[PDB]
Design a protein around this ligand. Structure first.
Ligand code: CIB
Ligand code: CIB
Ligand code: CIB
Ligand code: CIB
Ligand code: CIB
Ligand code: CIB
Ligand code: CIB
Ligand code: CIB
Lengths: 202, 202, 202, 202, 202, 202, 202, 202
């Protein structure tokens, strides 16, 4: 697993690959690791499949209910705080999961990286997660500039996850990307991604 | 143990062998590892006999009650989510079991592979489970094509579990197969299977 | 790692992929895992890189010296026995390596699979080795027939290692093949292999 | 693994199956587990493949040299004593092996069961060895009589090892049998065995 | 301990020996290990004496109460499912016991082998239990035929447990047998058993 | 295992049963546990079969060599001291064995019980050894009197070991007895023993 | 500790010695280890002093209350079942105690040996308990006959416990005996016992 | 620690940073991690300072002596093999070091990555080492092309190690680079490097 997230001048981008493993056994070539929380909020999951999936459901349901009840969409901060508390409450038998929760809201654009114990770091630009994160961080920290726009940012994301798949046998099989602009919450589809990494080597 | 599941263009196929072991002791040459959940939904069980049998009962009862109460059949997704949550709630003393739940429903055709912690991967084509899964995956990934039809898919299934029995001492003794077409939920009977693997070597 | 070996009616075939890992870290995309011992004898190495490489040198040197001194080429049996004894002598701090030594000699055609403790099995037809062996065994035990000829046997070999790369994150990156006929000891070169697996999917 | 040995009124019979395992992985369907030591002496090996194979070579070589030097064939007692001492000398890091050494000699007919620590029991009638021995002992202790003759004893042997293959997943794949009469040291060949167990069920 | 159970064409047979041990200490030469659950249902117990005894009481009481309340006798399946659930509920500190619950009921004839975790295998013919089971399985799998009748089946049972006592120091001291025909639920008494094994050697 | 030894007014008596076990597995019904060291000296062995057997050989050879060289038979004290030193020298990885070395010599009649560390107690009357010793001691300390004669002493011995077989699953299968009078070193043979315990119950 | 119990043709006899230890420290030369439960029921306690004493009080109180409430004396079976259940309920932190509960009741004469986990064996003749039981079993199994009468049975009991005191340093200091005939529940007093063992050696 | 090595079309480049740590303690801001073995051969060291430094001396001395004695410069292959063997000989208490040995020689251009156990991978293009390697690998695998020339390769190298220092607290403080062309073995000096990374951000 490897997922990235970058805050651009015009939005937010998040991406992940599709591999799920249990040791060296490749259990899945198409695991879902990117979830939609709100209209302009996404979440990427790295860690225990069962734990992540479980938590994802909770997160969604609570974001929904929040809106339906208060007639206001929850801010990423609210969802991040919510999730942190939940995670930390289980600090003595934590959910082995590394979350990325971000998007656009009344407060602006932001991304939060949250660990098993509910430690949340507010990402003001670049972030990678998963067994491949360190390689991904390589290119991200090389080519990123705050003025980057979401459109080239998705290329950068695919670029980084592509590198990581080359040195992390736990990553790979393909890549999902998501752009969160404001006028939209877009998900690229295999075709479009396959054509974006085509300008690379595969 | 070894169980396979493949989503064909015209349905779903699931199969397992009949061996149950405790170390090298072959406790059973005819263990049941394939269960019917709904009219067009089956489940294969790998892992702890006691745990799998216990969970099967729960799964069935809940599927039934769902329908009887809501007058709608539960979707595989619903049963899979249900089962995931249950499994994950016991994550600190998990039910050592690998489940395969699939069939046809209003949403389409699909199979879910669920682990002890409730981690569920949506199988869009091929899947194997059990101590023999890795060998079975060999032939499955070799001869499978999305256009494969349930009828040749059952042959493929028998084919894979047959290879597996040749390298996994924990597998063997025979094989059950199930076809879920729509016009039917068919179970082949020893005779028919014995005649399908007859075109192989035994 | 995943290596296969098959004894055909007209010779011997051995193949391996090129991946070397340390955890999930892919350390090499082109590791050498196939060595030439004598004119009609090869060896594939699975296990500890350092241990395998060390043993490989010893094996070659002793095979050479044997011939140079006795003016006779050593039989695979002689090299296999030699290696077994060496391996077993270190049984209390064994060389973590799974070896495949085979080819053609005055006694005929044969392959030996040898473990860390010097346990050698005489492969009279099919054999796989490495973290991907179980998947490879799948297709090997499915498509193999004693009448198979070395020429289609190299296809089969590529076929099996290809399946294995699909479910073993520790395998992959490419594949070496070697044909040991009698009139020759041939090594296919990337181009030729790339063209043989081209009739598959990649 | 499972091997039996019985002392008849007219000779000695010893048999084993052909399976070699590493966990549930069936590494070999045709492992050799019966060795000829002298003209009227055989040995069956249960345990670590590498250890047994290593010891077998030593046993043979020493039996040979004994005869070549003293122009007398070594008695089973001599080989058994020899092997005991060797085994026990390594008592603190023993060779994980269970040996059966027997045949006919100037002293009569006998079989010795020897363990890792060189503890040798003189079998005056029936004996089984390996992961399947306990099941084999079932039929052996049921149908054996001191007056049994080698010819029906080989049937009995196949009978016992056949039962064992039914409950010991570590046993199976076939069976070697050896008759040691005096006028001969005979090894039945697949055909003959296949026809002897044919009077059973397979 | 060693207990057997066989489903004949005309009924069910179950037998056990009478030894109870704590290490090598023979604590009892006449332990009871065969209980009557219903009119045509018996149960054999292997494992912890205290755990087995405790469970036996619960089983009986619940079978009784079932009939008294529903005016129907409980089927072996119902008792087996009941016992499974109870056993599995205590899966994290299980009752160290191996149970055999069978007899005749409206559904036919059947036997269930149930383990500490509530894993139940439906015995359609032969089954052994206890420290001597593996030896007992030897003769059972040797002499059994589906057409066997309860009358020769009790001989077979005595035969098997007799062999087992010969290689399992934890078994012995005597043997109880029970025939469940339909016209009866018979328990042989020492005299009758002593006379049945008399046709053997003791 | 269980062996006894008693010093009578007219000689020495030593006896043992014939069982050899590995867990609950009865490996032998006729193990030898009584050795002749000199003309009027015997030794019983309890413990590790391999260790006991190895030691027995050394003991014999050294007793022989002692006499051949010094033209005097070695006293039991000399053999006991010899054995003590050998045992104690290996005190940090001792030979798991309990030895009984006694008979008649120029110094009189005596028995020595020696443990793994070479601790030797001079038995002036009664002594038992093995897993059944404690039960054997029961009858020995009950019926023994210093005036007992070797002839009734052998009955006493059989008596004790017979009780022991009744509560020690590790003992049994038969019993060897040896009388060391002076005019003789007699070994009773199955027949004679079978007739001596016949005056008991079996 | 060492306690015996024997069922005679005319009643029941139970005896124990008086030693209580903590390591090699003799804490008591007159510990009470025999309790009266009902008019014709006694109980001997081996094990943890505090645990036994605690359980003894519970046993008595409940036997009493049983009778006072139902105006019937409780059968030994009832008390034994009662105690079993209590013991087993604490199976995960058991009361370290070995109990002997027996006497005469409407059902006949019987003795029950119960362990920490509530495993109760119904003693139909002979039984010993405690650190000395194995030696005591020696004489008991030697001199016992079903026709023995309580009067000689108390001699036998003293006899056995006397032997045990000779080889079990944890036993000794004296011996209590109790006869349960029907016309009486008698306790011999030091004088009478001292005079019964006087016909032995002390 | 983080070191990179790349084989260009016109030579070889190798670089490392200057940090040495013991936990979080920064022990050194200018540790030497690049050594000259021969005229056109360099070595980078990651791992234990003491181990690396020790091994470095041995390597140099042996390379020297080799040339002085044979009047030929040693090939990188020879030094790599030499080093492998040394490392492997100490496989049971290995030198905790990751080595990079490469340069230009009669055989061409190459780099070897060697581990504690003497496992050597032949780097045909890109390679990183140390706690920062995974990040470095990111940019290396992103910007590298076989046609890259040593001159831009040194930029790339500085680029990669610069990224790594950003996410590996164990790396940093500065960076050495070395070009091995043929007409030279050049080492850039702080000034030149400081000016090369100046085109980046620091
Ligand atoms: C659907 C999201 C999965 C994300 C993906 C990325 O890391 N994670 C995984 O694949 C994790 C990695 C392990 C080390 C926790 N795999 C797992 O959690 C697997 C999941 C099974 C469903 C195959 N199980 C175990 C015991 O590891
Ligand atoms: C009916 C379900 C059986 C499926 C089958 C496939 O894997 N599983 C099994 O056979 C499992 C495998 C082990 C490794 C958990 N066996 C078991 O669970 C056995 C079952 C006894 C009834 C013999 N028990 C133990 C303690 O292992
Ligand atoms: C190169 C020939 C060996 C086969 C190859 C394929 O798997 N083996 C390997 O890659 C083995 C696998 C492990 C599980 C022993 N890897 C290793 O031996 C590597 C070696 C490093 C130098 C990269 N890892 C460790 C921790 O020693
Ligand atoms: C070739 C005949 C050997 C006898 C045969 C019978 O038991 N033994 C075996 O098959 C033993 C069994 C294990 C439990 C020690 N297997 C082994 O020794 C295997 C051998 C490898 C070559 C696959 N290794 C390991 C670590 O298990
Ligand atoms: C009473 C019928 C049960 C079957 C019988 C046969 O094996 N079981 C037994 O004999 C079991 C075996 C152990 C290994 C759990 N014995 C026991 O449970 C004994 C029972 C005491 C009353 C002596 N306890 C202990 C701690 O060992
Ligand atoms: C052969 C005469 C020795 C006395 C005999 C009696 O107890 N000894 C034995 O039976 C010993 C007992 C164990 C606990 C050391 N058995 C053993 O030493 C067995 C011997 C094998 C040949 C089955 N080995 C193991 C590892 O248990
Ligand atoms: C009073 C009668 C109790 C029975 C008697 C028989 O064994 N038990 C005893 O004497 C037990 C024996 C040990 C091995 C549990 N002794 C004990 O329970 C002692 C009792 C103290 C009051 C001195 N405590 C300990 C920690 O040992
Ligand atoms: C000459 C190569 C030094 C490279 C440098 C970069 O990682 N290595 C190091 O700093 C290694 C790292 C540890 C994890 C083995 N450090 C060490 O070996 C330090 C050395 C002390 C002189 C500070 N000691 C300990 C106990 O760690």
């Amino acid at each position: 697993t490897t997922t990235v997230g970058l805050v651009c001048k015009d939005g937010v981008v998040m991406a992940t690959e599709k591999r799920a493993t249990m040791g060296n056994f490749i259990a899945s070539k198409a695991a879902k690791k990117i979830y939609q929380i709100a209209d302009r909020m996404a979440m990427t999951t790295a860690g225990s499949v069962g734990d992540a999936q479980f938590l994802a459901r909770i997160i969604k349901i609570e974001a929904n209910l929040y809106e339906i009840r208060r007639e206001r969409k929850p801010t990423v901060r609210a969802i991040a705080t919510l999730t942190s508390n939940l995670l930390n409450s289980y600090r003595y038998f934590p959910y082995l999961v590394q979350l990325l929760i971000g998007g656009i809201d009344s407060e602006g654009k932001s991304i939060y990286s949250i660990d098993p114990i509910g430690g949340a770091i507010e990402e003001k630009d670049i972030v990678a997660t998963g067994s491949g994160s360190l390689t991904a961080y390589g290119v991200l920290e090389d080519r990123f500039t705050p003025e980057i726009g979401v459109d080239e940012a998705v290329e950068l994301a695919v670029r980084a996850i592509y590198s990581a798949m080359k040195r992390d046998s736990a990553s790979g099989d393909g890549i999902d990307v998501v752009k969160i602009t404001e006028d939209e919450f877009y998900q690229y589809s295999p075709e479009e991604v396959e054509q974006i990494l085509a300008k690379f080597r595969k």
